[PDB]
Symmetry: D2
Subunit: 301 residues, 4 copies
């Protein structure tokens, strides 16, 4: 019998709630929205509010809020949005992963939780899943901001701007501006150095730019979207080329780390890590980024 995909979203804060609504809207599957029992009634309210929107927006999807992981049973994909001082989010990543793993042993996992490289590593180790089934989000969000900033600079559709991002957020980000185009035209040909360097730099600070404006909590629209593109690529077996936080076993000359790298995202999750020839400057830039990744993994208990 034909049955809908089941997707569970852990964390019913703004990113989690938004991701649940975007998945249901696209009819990608039934959605279970999970958070802690103290937040049970807010979570139920959000999900039911979302379900009450379905006759109007015209999507068929079930949406339930819960504090019981039993309801996540046989999820095809789980999206981890929980957490808030790295050990804080490590222990949450461990308690969550254990519960997710029991009810859906065959599930794929996407981790938003900061810092993503280390939090996705924890979820990988604790799960005992193969490496293709545990992905973190980072590069798509940085790519999204960079594309927004270049589209504003050139006054062109964001559809025709591409960014290229290895590594994580802020100072850990390794952008290849030489693999960044407008309609396939290298951006170094279109935007003078000061303004381009200023866009790379707004991309680094992009997460903080939103926190500072809000005054409380962090970004949620663009992060939720980023998670949803990654989920869609798996559920619809799209074999997208997307930057993902993936477990390395020799690629770029590193091993036993999660790093932000170009991947093929398909029905098996990470189909493959793509290995690029970097310039000496990019190699140097990435080596620095990885040292920062090792620096956080050693912060783990």
């Amino acid at each position: 019998a034909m049955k809908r995909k089941k997707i569970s979203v852990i964390g019913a804060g703004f990113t989690g709630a938004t991701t649940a609504f975007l998945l249901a809207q696209k009819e990608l599957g039934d959605v279970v929205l999970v958070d802690i029992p103290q937040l049970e009634n807010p979570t139920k309210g959000k999900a039911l509010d979302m379900l009450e929107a379905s006759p109007v927006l015209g999507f068929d999807a079930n949406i339930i809020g819960t504090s019981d992981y039993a309801d996540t049973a046989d999820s095809d994909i789980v999206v981890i949005t929980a957490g808030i001082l790295v050990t804080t989010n490590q222990k949450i990543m461990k308690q969550v992963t254990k519960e997710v793993v029991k009810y859906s042993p065959n599930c794929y996992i996407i981790v938003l939780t900061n810092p993503v490289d280390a939090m996705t590593y924890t979820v990988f180790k604790e799960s005992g899943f193969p490496k293709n089934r545990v992905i973190g989000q980072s590069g798509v969000l940085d790519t999204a901001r960079f594309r927004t900033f270049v589209a504003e600079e050139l006054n062109i559709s964001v559809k025709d701007v591409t960014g290229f991002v290895l590594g994580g957020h802020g100072d850990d980000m390794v952008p290849l501006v030489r693999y960044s185009y407008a309609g396939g035209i290298p951006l170094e040909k279109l935007i003078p150095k000061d303004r381009l360097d200023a866009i790379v730099e707004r991309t680094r600070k992009g997460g903080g730019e939103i926190v500072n404006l809000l005054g409380n909590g962090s970004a949620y629209y663009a992060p939720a979207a980023s998670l949803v593109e990654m989920v869609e690529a798996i559920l619809k077996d799209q074999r997208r080329i997307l930057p993902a936080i993936a477990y390395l076993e020799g690629e770029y000359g590193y091993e036993g780390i999660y790093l932000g790298v170009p991947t093929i995202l398909g029905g098996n999750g990470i189909e493959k890590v793509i290995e690029l020839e970097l310039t000496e400057e990019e190699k140097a830039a990435l080596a620095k980024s990885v040292e920062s990744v090792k620096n956080v993994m050693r912060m783990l208990e």
Copy 2:
């Protein structure tokens, strides 16, 4: 030259924000999200966050946050979600918002959410000087949305094949016609026993409070935002939908000078027509009771 539609959403709370995002995602036009000066930076941050989603979700829409009504200039539609003596308080906000809105957008259609929507839409109507077709309240679409959700759960069918029919406002002011409510065209009274169907009707009456009580802070925002977006799309794309709307009556149902939840044609001229149904004597008594409460709330205005 081909120009995008412009929509301003007043109120950058959860309903306002969710409405702006849904409008952009549908490529219905450029979106200006407005609130008070004290909240300007939070408004810009929500708007920028939404726009930064656009490369991933793959829509071309401009989203900007502001506290300056000049950024709302030449809006095709404005959605009022601003608000929280509830009547007396919100009346003040509606007069002040509407005076800025019409200054900058003299030819716009206005859709009002703010409760109580019957008295707040009346206040926007009188303050604006606009003809009745251009000043619209949201109520019944949201009530019908909950009703259909509940009926879809009850029968285990697509929400797409469930119809509700709702005159008047929320809760006890709601005048449902279950004889005009269907699953795949089949009267629900044929498919759901009376005890469960009255429970669904009562659940619809209370539906707004049910979310408020679960959230603990604030009210529903997803289904309200969707409800608003369905009405915006009907006007912007000139669809001539039959939808329940809070519309100004000049004779219809034997009432005049009030806004009331009634079935409407919604198109490019706004409310094209208020539809007049033959009501049974019970349904006329229910609607009179509902109108009594509307007049009651209008007698708290100044």
Copy 3:
């Protein structure tokens, strides 16, 4: 392993091609367009053209033309659109028997390569052709459906929308039975925003709308000069495909096998159904007036007449 739904479309004429293109556009799954060996090249050419559109319209769906039914293997759904239109001089019997032989040959190949698929039939006359596919397939009755009532309600809704100047989205039609003289419409279960149409459209004009629905297929035939409708038939197939693949549990009229519903058994008939992950989840049985019962009896009489032309 998350894997894509697979849909085979049998028949590469205008309705088949349009159905493949719509299924792919909606990313409902990978599409295999199938026709006879003699048309292998035109079938591959239409499929490659559709595929070449996918980057521009922005959908991930694979579309291939073929005449090798091995390429249909593990299809979740198969849409049969193959069959003959009548010519001047052709007996009623010969039209039925020719199309019956196609249905048998196609079904044998389908069930071999996709023994677990759902099958949706368009081929005229759809009651006797869906019956034929059913018997040949050995499938349980929930997995073999015909299309008829969706297309009739689509024309009905188009005419009503034009009469009232409102969105087709807020108009509903309700039809039992097949096309033309065999259609059994229920105007009393037909609405505009939930308002009974008999309260909104005067009897002469509403009666004319029903009649235009009856002749709806003929009207497109006479305008085109050669062949029949394809856009609205194609869309009608897609809505039924989507109901199943996305387990929507839609209420939709379908050509369903009856074992007692409405007082009939051993036949396919247009009836209201719930369409979902298990195909026909339920044939819905309504309280019919005495006139509607008599019109459905005369419609079943035509179904049984055509079933008696089967070899």
Copy 4:
């Protein structure tokens, strides 16, 4: 009052009809499908069939078929798919001269009823035919556009995607100039997820892909047997219509009028453009290599040779 955009499609062959159907489906505005008085009934049949699909696919749009250009009055956009394929006995010159007359006759009617529309031309040879529509209309250059590069990039991306086994959404092609030998593809400006295709595909198979792109139109002709591509050509036209109606400011390749760009004047040429609410907002000039400059000059000589065939 909010009023729908209005698009007229000239020619009710497979590309035109498919274009009309895709436009309606996207709710981009009301569609008027136009052909000659002789095909009025068939044009009306196709338009009615498409409109009767709209309740099922859930789109509100008016679609009419006509032979009366008065029904095109006040179009925001007009798409020209009309024109003749080469008859036996006909030279290239005769094919040019014949379609030139159709462009002129069509354009006269279009501008009489839609003095402010944007015009997009499919008709081959598109460089010389867009030029004809430009000069007959008396419109500014931003308002008259041909389609070519989008279709070639669609075929290219399809071939690259099947080579690398990845989403067509993550492949880009970059083509200057027209179809066949006139095509000037920049493989160095062609990527997968931003990665140059030269670093992912071996030269021999990349060369075969560039060659398959040149022959792409003919591969479809040869498979079909009796007509050319329609699905990818219609989709290409629709992406360009959408960029103008939704003022998207896409970077898309288009047949555009040059006054000095790449050193060329007084010709339409396949070039990268910004396409938005003003039509061609800008022709983008690239810094080309000496080989690329030489290839474009050869392609431009092909464009000038055809332009000399015009009367």
